[model samples]
Target chain A: CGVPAIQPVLSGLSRIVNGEEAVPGSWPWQVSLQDKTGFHFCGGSLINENWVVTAAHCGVTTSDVVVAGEFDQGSSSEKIQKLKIAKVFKNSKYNSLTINNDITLLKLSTAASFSQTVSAVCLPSASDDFAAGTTCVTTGWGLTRYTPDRLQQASLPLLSNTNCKKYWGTKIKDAMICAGASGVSSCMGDSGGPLVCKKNGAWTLVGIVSWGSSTCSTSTPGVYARVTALVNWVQQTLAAN
Target chain B: CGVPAIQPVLSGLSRIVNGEEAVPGSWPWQVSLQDKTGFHFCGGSLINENWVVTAAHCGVTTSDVVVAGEFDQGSSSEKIQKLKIAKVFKNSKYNSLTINNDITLLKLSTAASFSQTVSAVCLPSASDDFAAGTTCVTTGWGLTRYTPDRLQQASLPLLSNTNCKKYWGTKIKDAMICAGASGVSSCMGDSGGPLVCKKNGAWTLVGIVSWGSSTCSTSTPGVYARVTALVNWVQQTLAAN
Candidate 1:
């Protein structure tokens, strides 16, 4: 499910602060979760033909539509696919205040058709744990000083929990993964976006953008819901749903 | 001269903010100019085997050394080449207060040997002018909130003089070019770095970082010495030397 016909272009383009616009079809599994009026509010990762994963804080509903294979929101493209969501599942342990267990799943009304620009990202095994300093990529239609119409992608290094705790103190939990370097980070609208790293040549989903400093401070690391820590719940939910 | 033996890996890696660490040898012409103690203080571009181009305000001297084929300043590499400067030439019309005619050249004590990681960028004709929307890249060891040891790169679009005037007003002169978008920009230490664009499949030196807002404000576009406008002076200087 993680294999994509089109590989994401990693170099020589352009900023999410310091991100550049991603090639249109490079990130095939990225999904833009849109509200009823067609405004994109959050990002998600398609795990399979029928299921999508995001942050529970995104608070998805059946009325929300999922857009895949879209790069620029201001323009139209033939590769773009708009799908209806059938069900929303937020983790039972999710806490709004503490932002714990901030992962969620979305069931598509119909299975997505696999194409060069529409595919699924690979999910890591429950035991999978990437070492700190491993570089991963995150994509979203997030807030920037100048609003960009195209999807933005940034490469960030994973930070150890110890290093992350120095910035977030007790707020950095085991259920969360931290990444970022100085000024480069995920911003407000990046919530629920996929943080995938290349492992053994294939992109594997590692974390889900959950929360960070309100100002998107340059010194703070971005915190995400660690997908490896919750893969079991994902498999169980997919089977039941 | 623009062609490198190894093509730059333009995709997949990690930021200058909204920027990322460049593949060590991708930008073959990039140069780090260091002070007496070997502290990287500015960046430049290799225009030829024996000459480097930078900003006039960089105030280079015989005591300064030019380091090419290098990426991380905090680490050592076999590919790195350190060369002594035989002479330094600031623009004849340079004005510190106005930052006008802010371009410079340096002659190496010995000719540089071309390799996969050390080559010269193509110089545009004096009459050459790129359209305002053309995308170009800038690289340096600039000031990020978190200091980076590796060379950082960011892709920025050329802005029309009219649009640039909105940011810097009369401070934007005919000898200068503007390129930036919100949070992505060249900062303090990035002065004298290369602003390059790919033309006809080869990287071309288009500008030299000159001046920008003091704070590196996200809203202000970074201004550079227009290489096209000063190509004649560069050629004359090279020939006379």
Candidate 2:
């Protein structure tokens, strides 16, 4: 009938890596999207006290709920709270065919509580991307490839600039940051996972979920929405609020 | 030369979850001998038209042509309507690393299904080891993780149980279970895929390609069977069958 033990065993979920005790709260806004069925790659960030940034394509049409700062599934709903999407803003020039401008943001019904598992990732200054081989980690609740089973997650070493561009194209847009393929890769629900890069020993949000190789193979690499390119827009939106 | 679209967007290739995920329907049926790519993760199912607790594994073997159920690649003779196996049967004294006796049946063949999508998945017997908190999934020449991408023909996942003891002391002993770590797990072609548990789930098998995963997440947890201990007697018996 009902599976009681299938809790979200969200293990090895990382943070800013800026020396924070693994208790709870920190990036209070980074959340995983889950529902009666399960979780997908839909996640968000806390812009201020209440607003979260996710892909406009994620929660826009779907009647899905957002789980924030929580891991461990339905059992840990107390620690991880679900919020309704009050708004979704797709990038003006988003092109599905070319996967250009694959970015979006969400405004949560309630503000997030800053804690170890629930803190806000610092947005890059107007424009920023991870240093080549800087090891930026993107987390999400997407499929392992296609098999939708659990709210499983993974973190791959962000690809390097040279390698990433080589895989996709030399036409690296302005509002985008290019990640390479070295460690593990990203997947569907990882659309909004932060590309947390270290700057001066602090983590910076340098990219947003964009796309990856169709199949999870070594030759194919994952792509990210370059944060460095979209700095002006990010600033304008945050500043407008 | 290069495909018309991006590599991940070819639109006909399937990708499974990464290795070590707790997917539901991942790799199944572990044998004592190293079947290697010599064998394909074929999909199967149990027919209840008759009075029998059927399993997909029951209708499968080490050698059989696989006709995956995808349409992108096209042409039955091209990648569908498969071959047959040499022999098949359950194990007498299954091994752990090789197979946990979670294996049953075998086929014999050399050439594997190259992008063939139609496949089979073994059923979960009453003796199987799925439990609460155990993630599970299924895969085949199913839906593409991304519509923009090519359709993948195989898949894998992590399952629920932590440990399996299918062939501990006797032949056809215990019904096994499986699970695995999260993220970057199995791919699409891994149908009749092995479902596993955490810790020992990575290489184990529990269920066959019962069906498909819910969605396409790179970190999904599917199911599988235990085959390491299943080789001992299964290899000989199936070869004789």
Candidate 3:
């Protein structure tokens, strides 16, 4: 469910501050969550042919479209696919103001056609453990001053819960994972994007972009909704829906 | 002057239509030409610690500042250097209406300090030949819908004079080099930016972004003022000034 047909090219960069542009179709599982007018507002990850994982705070609805195999949103490409959202399942424990348990799942109306440029990322098992200092990648069509048309990527080292707590204080929760360093981070519009770590060679979903410093400051680390913490809920939701 | 302490990480991308964000200080010589209010308007290349190369059409003046060692224009970084222009040298043969001989040079009021994030690009020899299909890269804080705060880069194949004429026809001049593809081309705000090609390991200045399709169309190729064609003039201007 998580192996990508096309392996992502990692340059250790970040839509990210100090991030670099990603090669087209490199992050095959990356999804652009768009509004009715086709404006990209958030990012998502394709877990299967029909299911996508994103952040509940993105406020996605069934009316929104899920665009896959897209790189540049400003231009037309043959690899791009637009699919309707059959349903959106926001986490029942999600809190908008506190941004707690920020997770969401979307079922595509039609199954995505897997290709070299359209594939799914691997989901991590509940037992999967990504320790501190593990290098992971996050991708998005987010803002670096302005939203980039091409997908952006950044490599961030995983911060231990204790270390992350130093920056975010008690706000850092077990349901969240923190990753970032000076001059590199996920910024606005990166919400719901995948933070995938290479495990045993295959990229595994580790976190989902959720919340962080409002200014995208270098001193603050980015906080993400922990995918491993909610693996059971995701599997159950996928099975039932 | 072209030897960079930090070698550029070329991943074969394009601020470009399909461009990627550049690693900070990778293109150390790239300059963000800004107005009095520090609003970036065009791009330039550091030819030496004191001299910068750009395009005549950028309409740069002494009041404009030259920002080097910058990756993101929207945020602050320690490596960024803002220099004042002591003098502006617009090519005597430059034609604003036709955009021919579109080269310009800037003399910094004070010499820039060379570091890992601030260096210089080599100028092409007058007789140097960069034939068709030679891969070249261009960088700028250009538009892809909105102007990206981070510097964007794209790789393009150099087009032969004859092949370029097929796209631009009579507008193609002997003093110009054309490069681009179906989904890549420089856009507005990229004007006066450097187009560099690796020659024997050192990055050499090959062209300067001069003009292109109004929409940055995929069907149309991008045109640059050929640096090889003006190498003699550039040397003479530097010597006389």
Best by DockQ: 2
DockQ of each: 0.01, 0.01, 0.01
Model 1 lDDT, residue B66, Cα: 96
C-alpha lDDT of residue A153 in model 3: 80
Model 1 lDDT at residue A186: 63
Q: What would the DockQ be for model 1?
A: 0.01
Give one digit per residue, the lDDT tens place, for model 1 in B116-159.
99999999998887889887888778764226777777777789
lDDT of 2 by residue, B140-196 (tens): 332322221122323323343432122112212234433322443344423343342
List the candidate 1 regions with Cα displacement exceeding 4 Å. A12-17, A144-146, B1-241
lDDT of 2 at B216: 34
> Model 1 over residues A59-172: C-alpha lDDT tens digits?
666788899888778886456788999998878666543466789899999988878889999999989879999878888787632277788888878999999999878887
Candidate 3, residue A117: Cα displacement in angstroms equals 68
User: A112-227, model 2: which lDDT tens digit per residue?
Assistant: 65554555666676534455656555554444434433333344465566666777675455545555344444553366665566566455666677666656443455667776
Kept native contacts, as fractions per model, are 0.00, 0.00, 0.00
Model 2 chain A weakest lDDT span, ten residues long:
A1-10
lDDT of 3 by residue, A164-183 (tens): 99988877788999988656
